[PDB]
Symmetry: D2
Subunit: 121 residues, 4 copies
């Protein structure tokens, strides 16, 4: 795959993901979150496994965003792991982990988990 | 800090992580897994939040590895989210998500979750 | 809350969750999965926090299903953690962990994570 | 096995788990957390898969704790999913999900994820 991963996608919270997939598995772009201690665009970097497998499977991929930019520094980073499914309606179905930097004392509650579904709609 | 993160790290499974942290919050390197449908090294890219806080908080970061290289293609990708704690014995504590590409029907069992702790080797 | 948690709910995979909420926080019932190494009904037990909080929040709850019954024994168990939201369309939004029993060697890949949304529709 | 699981267990944070495993695959007991918006004991209910396999596999199980008792109401619930490994030093290795009740708008940050390892105390 790689196919139509490039583009501007949006998730159910109204966040915008603008990405470019390189033919060798790299993903680059920017992220703008509609929620959280975030504002404006953030740099993202990831990878996607091409050469996926005939049995109409999705393409595994993942990316990271460290929430620091020239506007805010939320001392956290999020990683999204999921797969791309194309067709008439293409989607990127993910599960993410958002880790904030804590002291040892609070390390037990440093990580949130959630799921996001992206479309070009 | 970039310097503290740059280096060779190993985790409890015997996997290897070689990374360099750029002043821009970038992370690039290779990962070698001791387990799984993997062989040789794989490229990794990630980011880390460059200006943490003062205090004794960890530095948040995350990176991704798509499990495809010249020797093998597992059709999966793993992302590690965690924090770096420097010091005499520095550690990177993480939780990860491993998604395999599946058909729509099997998408419910596409992701594995786990945690890994990495120890830095001297240098 | 507790309100209308009792009932028969269904999720996006077509699984059926039949539960009874006791006024003291207990949840009891049976589960039938439309997918996996499962067949017929399985016993479930859980808890839900009542006395929830005015700011129209959901009610936190969770439950477990060990996948052994008189038909199959899949040597695994799933726990769903989420919150109930009622109203005209009530839903139970969850994230689950499915752990299978492995040898130490395979312990690194014993746990799957996912999300299910239940409705009475 | 029911007998092996029944007992008092503690985890790395200093929390206490007292449980009894019924021959029907049931688990009942109390949990006391060393951290969080919690105080005193809380009731727990769960299940465990009674007939594991022969082999040196773990026994899968899980339990839930809603964080409400006579002294405090945190409006949250935690579920622990993991496996029991018996032996001279028995352990229960788990991963957990802690969901707080939120408004629809904040539902994206309602769940925390983590892992705990429990060690059995003699008796
Ligand atoms: O608050 C923070 O720490 C920074 C913003 C986090 C926004 C999160 S990342 C996962 C979820 N998906 C989104 O589009 N935004 C939230
Ligand atoms: O089997 C695969 O799909 C590729 C190899 C996965 C190895 C995983 S990623 C998380 C965990 N950490 C490691 O060091 N190895 C395993
Ligand atoms: O295959 C197994 O180990 C037993 C069946 C597991 C079915 C799972 S649990 C989470 C998800 N939600 C469902 O309704 N079914 C699957
Ligand atoms: O703060 C709350 O919402 C209630 C207390 C939560 C304590 C958690 S549950 C997971 C982890 N394991 C423990 O032993 N304590 C923390």
């Amino acid at each position: 795959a790689e196919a139509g991963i490039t583009g501007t996608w949006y998730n159910q919270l109204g966040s915008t993901f603008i990405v470019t997939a390189g033919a060798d598995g790299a993903l680059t772009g920017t992220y703008e979150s509609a929620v959280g201690n975030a504002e404006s665009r953030y740099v993202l970097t990831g990878r996607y496994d091409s050469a996926p497998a005939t049995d109409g499977s999705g393409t595994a991929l993942g990316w990271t965003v460290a929430w620091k930019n020239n506007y805010r520094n939320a001392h956290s980073a999020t990683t999204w792991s999921g797969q791309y499914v194309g067709g008439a309606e293409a989607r990127i179905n993910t599960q993410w982990l958002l880790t904030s930097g804590t002291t040892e004392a609070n390390a037990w509650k440093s990580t949130l988990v959630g799921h996001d579904t992206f479309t070009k709609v």
